[PDB]
Amino acid sequence: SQCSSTLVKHIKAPLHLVWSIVRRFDEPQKYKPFISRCVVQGKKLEVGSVREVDLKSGLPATKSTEVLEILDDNEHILGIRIVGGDHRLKNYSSTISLHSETIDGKTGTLAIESFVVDVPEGNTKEETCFFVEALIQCNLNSLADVTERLQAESM
Ligand SMILES: N#Cc1ccc(CC(=O)NC2(C(=O)O)CCCCC2)cc1C1CC1
C-alpha cells in the first residue's frame, strides 16, 4: 500500500543555473508543463511556505496544495509534500536534488527526484508507481529543456 521510485535526468547546464529554477517553490510552472498557475503567501521560499497550484485544464484534477519541507541552498535539495487538492494522491512527498556531473567534457547537472506516496485502496502498486514516474520524467525532460535554452541564451 505504498510505492516509491527515483527518476534522474542529465542536464547540459551549470548547476547554479538549474538550481535557480528548481528552488523557485513559488513558480513551478516555470518548467512543469502540467501546472498553469501557483500562489504563495508569506515569505515565499522558507520551510513551511504553502502553495496553491492550479493545474492545466483537461486533467484528472485541477487543484493541489503543497508544503515546502526542505529547501537547502547549499546542497541544492528541494523537498515538498502535497496535502490537499482534488486529486487521488495521499501522503505524497518528494525530494529533488542537484549534483555536479561532467557531460561532454563540460560541467553539467544531474537532477534526481525521489518520491513516496500511498497506493489508493482501489488501485495497484505497479499502476500507481508508474503513473507518477511518467509525470516526473516529463517534468525533468522539460526542466532540461528550459535550463539548456537559458544556458544557450547566455551567449
Ligand atoms: N492527477 C494529477 C496531476 C497531474 C500533474 C500534476 C502536476 C505535477 O507535475 N505534479 C508532480 C510535481 O512534480 O509537481 C509530479 C507528479 C506527482 C505529483 C507531483 C499534478 C497532479 C495532481 C496533483 C497530483
Distance 32 CA to ligand 1 centre (A): 9
Residues 5/93, Cβ–Cβ less than 8 Å = no
Q: Which of 115, 46, 59 is closest to 87 using CA atoms?
A: 59
Q: Using what technique was this structure determined? A: X-ray
- Kindly report the backbone phi and psi dihedral angles of residue 60, in degrees, each rounded to the nearest multiple of 5, phi listed first: -55, -20
Based on the number of CB atoms within 10 Å of its own CB, is 7 exposed (0-12), middle (13-18) or buried (19 or more)? buried
Query: Domain spans of the chain?
Result: 1-155
3-state helix, strand, coil in the chain (%, to 5): 25, 40, 30
62 is in an annotated binding site: yes
65 is in an annotated binding site: yes
Residues 136/80, Cβ–Cβ less than 8 Å = no
With a 6 Å cutoff on the Cβ, whether 81 touches ligand 1 is no
- The single-letter DSSP state of residue 57 is S
Q: CA-to-CA distance for 88 and 110, rounded, in angstroms?
A: 30
Q: Which residues pair with 65 in a beta bridge?
A: 52, 84
Q: Whose CA is nearest to atom 24 of ligand 1?
A: 87
Residues 9/110, Cβ–Cβ less than 8 Å = yes
Measured from the Cα of 85, ligand 1's closest atom is 23
88 is in an annotated binding site: yes
Residues 19/144, Cβ–Cβ less than 8 Å = no
Question: What's the CATH superfamily of 1-155?
Answer: START domain (3.30.530.20)
Q: CA-to-CA distance for 84 and 107, rounded, in angstroms?
A: 39
Distance 135 CA to ligand 1 centre (A): 7
Which residue shows C-alpha cell 513558480?
Answer: 27
